[PDB]
Design a protein around this ligand. Structure first.
Ligand SMILES: [Mg+2]
Ligand SMILES: [Mg+2]
Ligand SMILES: [Mg+2]
Ligand SMILES: [Mg+2]
Ligand SMILES: [Mg+2]
Lengths: 53, 438, 98, 133, 64
RNA sequence: GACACGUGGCUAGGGGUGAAAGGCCAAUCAAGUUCGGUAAUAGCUGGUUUUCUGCGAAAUCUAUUCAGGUAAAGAGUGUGUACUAAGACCAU
RNA sequence: GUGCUAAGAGUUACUCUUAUCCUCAAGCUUUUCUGGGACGGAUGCUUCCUAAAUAGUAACGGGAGUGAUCAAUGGUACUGCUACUUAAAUAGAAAGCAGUGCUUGACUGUAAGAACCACAGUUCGAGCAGGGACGCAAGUCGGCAUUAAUGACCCAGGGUAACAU
């Protein structure tokens, strides 16, 4: 809702080729840039994914 | 997945069917895995069938009838055969040698005989030239044509002369396992006389091709059984001789091709090599083929248990031969109806594809009494009267075996399938078994 | 002769759906028999998603166009007076004609 | 809505892999041999066999354990795990052929399009076309 | 035009190969920045997860 | 007399005229009459014309600018296919 | 469109072009359920009673919820203690209460078979391939004990890939 500040945001790969994961995040409770190791099908190896809008 | 109980589309079948290419009806025929499935495909496209589709339908009817273990005289098979016979009569001069060979082999292996003027048209269309049809067609088409025309009657002996004159220069370029079908087709008609001469010449050159080493070790299994039978039946009459090179090659390749024969093919091959050594069963070959004979006796039809019982007739005192023979005794007890089924029930017989006729072979095994098994109960009776001391340890078993042999003989004599000589031999064998049974 | 279509509920909002649900919605399903019967009687015989261009075949090319202009097509059409009688129950008379 | 939640296949009913045996809210019935359990505690069969419902001692009280007992003609045609998988595969293939024979070509089983092969990945069978480098 | 297309394909292949070579250092940097079990918020030390959140948020503000 | 009458004339329809009443404008005027578009439109009402024979429902359910309309499912008929059944009862 | 107005332009008051307040003349809209209509109330989804011991079952019939939260409240492997966990029902020696060590399976491509069901959709799903996580292993992991938090298509926008100009 409008009171709930949690939004959907995008996780862009470090490797290249722009594969991404869209996952939700709380801005207030997480002012990190969200970084997780996820599978990248273009390279078929796990790489890192930082948060960009 | 349409509606949760309807089968989801298969992967390779959807990949094969979704093409820009033509050939949809033949691909639907080739993915039909049972009989009225094929009949519904022939019903859906009955205003759309062409000669290629008729050839594919005949071949698929042949394969699906052999794929189950149900008789070719079933009403479903005969209806599909007559429906294809209508289109064969429509396109009787348009069919090329591929399609004519397809429809002839497919309608002969389901034992549906065409009208003989149609067979005459379909063979004269194969030879209405300077033999040019039989020189542009591959070896499998000639094999299927010969197998189809060995059925449907048609022992014309003038058509066969020009066919054998056309196939004789091309025969050494053939793949070496289509040769036994050619020799069997020549023997199956009234050709190869004195139990004209280009037929005997091409049979002799085919058996000269089959007799050699380095190919006889390269035939497929169950083709070496027919090749060994043809050699043992036609060696001294026309072709190759007694010589131990051939018998050594046959025994060596038989020791390698043992597991790849179905249990209905093993005793034919072993009687073939027994006839080969008389032109016997040598050491350390029976001791490795007999575990296969015991392991194949659980699923083995009654003429095959004849051939195995005749094979194990001249020696019974050996314990491995003895319990193999009591395994065949229990098998013959199983598939022959009681004089008074209970294995499976008749209400649950599959209408499906895989071995549905085998389930119908159990669940009241009466009704499988055709003429082949009608003479074959007499043959099995003789073969078990020959093998006394192997089964005679079991008194009640051989007594019930004699009861079922006598019951089947009386029933099939009532059906008109036996005569007085076979009845007398059956009576002698059943009184020998019943005297041994008490 | 079966009429096939892609499954709906897959264009957007894929974050709120499970992995199995998204895998299930990628598949195609045949139309229901009643709807398929109406389309078959209406005369629907489309063998391709879009018509293949007669150009782009080797040897069959424009005399002066390097290729051609594609013109991406839209799919909205519903009015109770003029377009798509299939998408309206009745016909509405026009608005006074000036 | 309707939310139908009951037991679909009773005890002594022959089951095949994937068939839902019971649908419940919470583990009223607990999974046993040759039986899987879903997210919503749906009990589904992972082997060909007759369903058996037996009661066993439990942590709170009288646990009911739902199981699938394999056929006695299976485990005789079957190291053992590979042999069972081969026997189950043939039974599953036979079931499909019998079902296709009983539904006499009156349902739309396979795509058969006039199009180029339905989109195929290296694995194949994708109803999703994806452009390749 | 195809020469420009192959040049773009080679350039993107080159950058993905270089980043894939650099990539083990990037996961090690991320894993080290999340790891906190050394040099705690103070010399008090006295509870592991409580000390593994305040420093992590302080490092997140430092590494923002 | 802010009168009445007679004879021609002028203002005409989304317009005229009105000491103003939704009044009058050739006996149906909050939009004249006639002709044309026009065989307008009407999920509404009414009606549908010779005979015999066989079979024979439904008024539930879901969706709907939709609940007096429509479409799908259920229940009907003809045709095809196929089981001693994907059927009905009864017993254990 | 119409009347004034604004800003440019022409013959050089008048006329043209463009725009827009306030007037005049029009053209279009202005749902539905309802023991009549109006008024009031409601229109998704989940649970409990009706609902009659498979399932299912109505009424502006009766009582609680919900349009989320959480980078841990996810996954995996463990450590202590024992009457709670929640919207209700079914359940739970952990699916409860406090903790830890690593991690992102809160994946990529699929999936036989079923529940359900007018259709669209909805629900479970063993198994296979890839690359990974935890665990000595056994083996689990395609978000959270489940049932709510899931708005088609069109249109518009973004990343990437192929073809084209
Ligand atoms: Mg008018
Ligand atoms: Mg009624
Ligand atoms: Mg109604
Ligand atoms: Mg919502
Ligand atoms: Mg785009």
């Amino acid at each position: 809702g409008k009171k709930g500040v949690r939004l959907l945001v995008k996780l862009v790969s470090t490797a290249k080729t722009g594969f991404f994961y869209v996952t939700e995040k709380n801005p207030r409770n997480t002012p990190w840039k969200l970084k997780l190791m996820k599978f990248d099908p273009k390279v078929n190896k796990h790489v890192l994914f930082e948060e960009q809008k | 997945l349409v509606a949760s109980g309807i089968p989801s589309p298969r992967a390779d079948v959807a990949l094969q069917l979704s093409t820009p290419h033509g050939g949809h009806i033949n691909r639907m025929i080739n993915t039909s895995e049972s009989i009225v499935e094929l009949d519904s495909i022939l019903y859906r496209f009955r205003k759309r069938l062409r000669p290629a589709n008729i050839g594919a339908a005949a071949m698929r009817l042949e394969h699906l009838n052999r794929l189950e273990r149900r008789t070719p005289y079933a009403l479903r098979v005969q209806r599909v055969a007559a429906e294809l016979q209508k289109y064969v009569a429509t396109y009787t001069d348009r069919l090329a040698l591929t399609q004519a060979a397809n429809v002839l082999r497919g309608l002969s292996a389901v034992r549906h005989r065409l009208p003989p003027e149609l067979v005459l048209r379909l063979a004269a269309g194969a030879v209405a030239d300077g033999g040019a049809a039989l020189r542009l067609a591959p070896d499998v088409d000639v094999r299927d044509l010969c197998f189809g025309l060995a059925g449907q009657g048609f022992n014309n002996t003038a058509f066969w002369a020009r066919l054998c004159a056309a196939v004789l220069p091309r025969l050494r370029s053939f793949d070496p396992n289509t040769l036994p079908a050619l020799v069997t087709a020549l023997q199956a008609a009234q050709q190869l006389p004195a139990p004209s001469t280009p037929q005997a010449a091409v049979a002799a050159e085919a058996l000269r091709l089959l007799s050699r080493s380095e190919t006889l070790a390269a035939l497929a299994p169950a083709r070496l059984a027919d090749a060994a039978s043809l050699l043992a039946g036609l060696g001294p009459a026309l072709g190759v001789a007694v010589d131990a090179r051939l018998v050594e090659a046959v025994q060596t390749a038989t020791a390698r091709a043992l597991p790849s024969l179905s249990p209905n093919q093993l005793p034919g091959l072993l009687l073939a090599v027994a006839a080969l050594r008389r032109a016997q069963l040598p050491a350390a070959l029976l001791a490795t083929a007999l575990p296969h004979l015991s392991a194949g006796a659980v699923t083995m039809d009654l003429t095959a248990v004849m051939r195995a019982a005749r094979l194990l007739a001249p020696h019974a005192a050996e314990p491995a031969a003895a319990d193999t023979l009591v395994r065949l005794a229990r098998r013959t007890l199983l598939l022959l109806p009681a004089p008074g089924e209970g294995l499976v029930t008749l209400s649950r017989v599959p209408r499906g594809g895989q071995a549905a006729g085998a389930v119908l072979a159990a669940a009241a095994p009466a009704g499988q009494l055709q003429g082949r098994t009608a003479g074959a109960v007499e043959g099995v009776a003789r073969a078990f009267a020959a093998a006394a001391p192997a089964v005679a340890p079991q008194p009640a078993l051989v007594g019930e075996l004699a009861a079922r042999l006598a019951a089947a003989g009386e029933a099939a004599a009532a059906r008109g399938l036996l005569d007085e000589a076979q009845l007398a031999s059956l009576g002698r064998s059943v009184e020998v078994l019943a005297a041994a049974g008490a | 002769g079966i009429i096939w279509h892609r499954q709906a509920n897959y264009r957007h909002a894929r974050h709120a759906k499970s992995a199995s649900q998204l895998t299930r919605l990628k598949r195609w399903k045949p139309l229901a028999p009643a709807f398929a019967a109406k389309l078959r009687k209406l005369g629907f015989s489309e063998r391709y998603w879009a018509a293949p261009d007669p150009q782009d075949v080797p040897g069959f090319h424009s005399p002066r166009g390097r290729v051609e202009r594609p013109r991406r097509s839209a799919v909205p059409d519903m009015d109770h007076t003029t377009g798509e009688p299939a998408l309206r129950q009745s016909w509405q008379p026009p608005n006074r004609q000036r | 809505x309707x939310x139908x939640x009951x037991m679909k296949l009773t005890a002594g009913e022959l089951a095949f892999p994937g068939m839902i045996i019971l649908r419940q809210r919470g583990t009223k019935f607990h999974p046993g041999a040759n039986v899987g359990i879903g997210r919503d505690h749906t009990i589904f069969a992972t082997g060909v066999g007759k369903v058996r419902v037996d009661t066993q001692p439990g942590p709170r009280g009288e646990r009911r354990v739902v199981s699938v007992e394999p056929l006695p003609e299976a485990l005789a045609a079957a190291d053992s795990a590979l042999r069972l998988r081969q026997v189950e595969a043939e039974l599953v293939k036979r079931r499909a052929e019998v079902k296709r024979a009983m539904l006499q070509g009156r349902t739309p089983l396979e795509p058969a399009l006039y199009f180029p092969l339905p989109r195929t990945a290296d694995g194949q069978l994708s109803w999703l076309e994806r452009s390749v480098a | 035009r195809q020469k420009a297309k192959e040049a773009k394909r080679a350039a993107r292949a080159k950058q993905v190969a270089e980043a894939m070579a650099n990539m083990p250092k990037t996961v090690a940097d991320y894993k080290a920045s999340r790891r906190l079990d050394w040099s705690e918020v103070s010399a008090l030390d006295r509870x592991x997860x409580x000390x593994x959140x305040x420093x992590x948020x302080x490092x997140x503000x430092x590494x923002x």
